[PDB]
Amino acid sequence: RNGNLKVDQNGMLTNASGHLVLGENDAPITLPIPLSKIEIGRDGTISVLP
């Protein structure tokens, strides 16, 4: 229940404890490296701007 998330140098989404955040395919979320604006949705949808 700790939502103190962060983005590493490779885009993998982790939390404050270092645990990798699971995604839609039951796999860790890996976002594109060159981001411009991360805007998480209310339902959990992650919309990012390249």
């Binding site: 103190n4 962060k6 590493d8 140098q9 490779n10 404050a16 411009s36």
Partner: protein, 262 residues
């Protein structure tokens, strides 16, 4: 020692780290390009006592599977790189980045440190340097002595006006660096950051293309600290600090009753 004593002591250290983080933000409440930090807490591991050895799981809602925690700790002091407000100043040598970007300065040891502080000035030779320690800005920008006014374009192009020559002449162009994870940068003081493994690779470019920010002349980026927010966090951290001391006193008084009465 008694386990209850050390569990509360770890809570006291966590709050003491939190206090030192809050006081750092309030001290840097006027620094230009300063990003506030927040202490992140997490619990310490849970130990099975009534299972033989370190065996775990099974019936965790029974005396056999009772698990006891070890306290709390501060795992990371996270830098909040929220864009700060702009200060409009009349000095023509101070600059600002709106959006993502870091100014680049050349450290004495050779490498380049990345800064959000745009309070620059000129040295004896005319090279643009930081108005603090004096580390030159990369790329090197040299101002001719006959120049009258310095104009820095929104894409980093520095041009000067020379009397007797219509139209400005360009004497250099700045570049700014953006990182994949600016929160992974290592602070070294002097409003300077150093690249690390968790940060990523320095991605330079013209300030205004490929998602980079723009250079604003005669403006300064104020610190993004919220003085009221720090004071509210100070209240919560103070009361939690006192609460853990109550437990330590309670354990000491309980044990003092044993060896005295018994």
């Amino acid at each position: 020692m008694h386990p209850a004593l050390w569990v509360s002591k770890t809570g006291l250290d966590a709050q003491q780290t939190n206090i030192a983080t809050i006081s750092n933000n309030l001290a840097n409440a006027s620094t230009v390009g300063y990003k506030k930090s927040r202490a992140v807490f997490e619990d310490l591991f849970y130990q099975n006592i009534n299972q033989p050895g370190g065996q775990s799981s099974q019936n965790t809602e029974l005396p056999s599977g009772l698990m006891l925690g070890a306290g709390s700790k501060v795992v990371a002091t996270q830098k909040v790189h929220t864009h700060g407000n702009a200060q409009t100043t009349t000095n023509a040598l101070d600059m600002m980045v709106e959006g993502d970007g870091f100014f680049q300065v050349t450290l004495p040891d050779g490498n380049i440190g990345y800064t959000r502080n745009g309070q620059f000035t000129l040295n004896g030779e005319g090279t643009l340097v930081t108005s603090g320690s004096g580390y030159p800005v990369e790329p090197e920008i040299v101002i001719p002595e006959d120049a009258i006014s310095i104009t820095v374009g929104t894409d980093g192009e520095v041009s000067v006006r020379v009397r007797g020559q219509q139209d400005n002449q360009v004497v250099g162009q700045l570049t700014i660096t953006d990182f994949v994870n600016p929160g992974g940068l290592e602070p070294i003081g002097q409003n300077l950051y150093l690249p690390t493994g968790a940060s990523g690779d320095p991605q330079e470019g013209v300030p205004g293309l490929d998602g980079l920010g723009e250079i604003r002349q005669s403006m300064l980026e104020a610190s993004n600290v919220n003085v009221t927010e720090e004071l509210v966090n100070m209240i919560e951290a103070q009361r939690v600090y006192e609460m853990n001391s109550k437990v330590i006193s309670s354990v000491d008084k309980m044990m003092s009753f044993v060896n005295q009465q018994l």
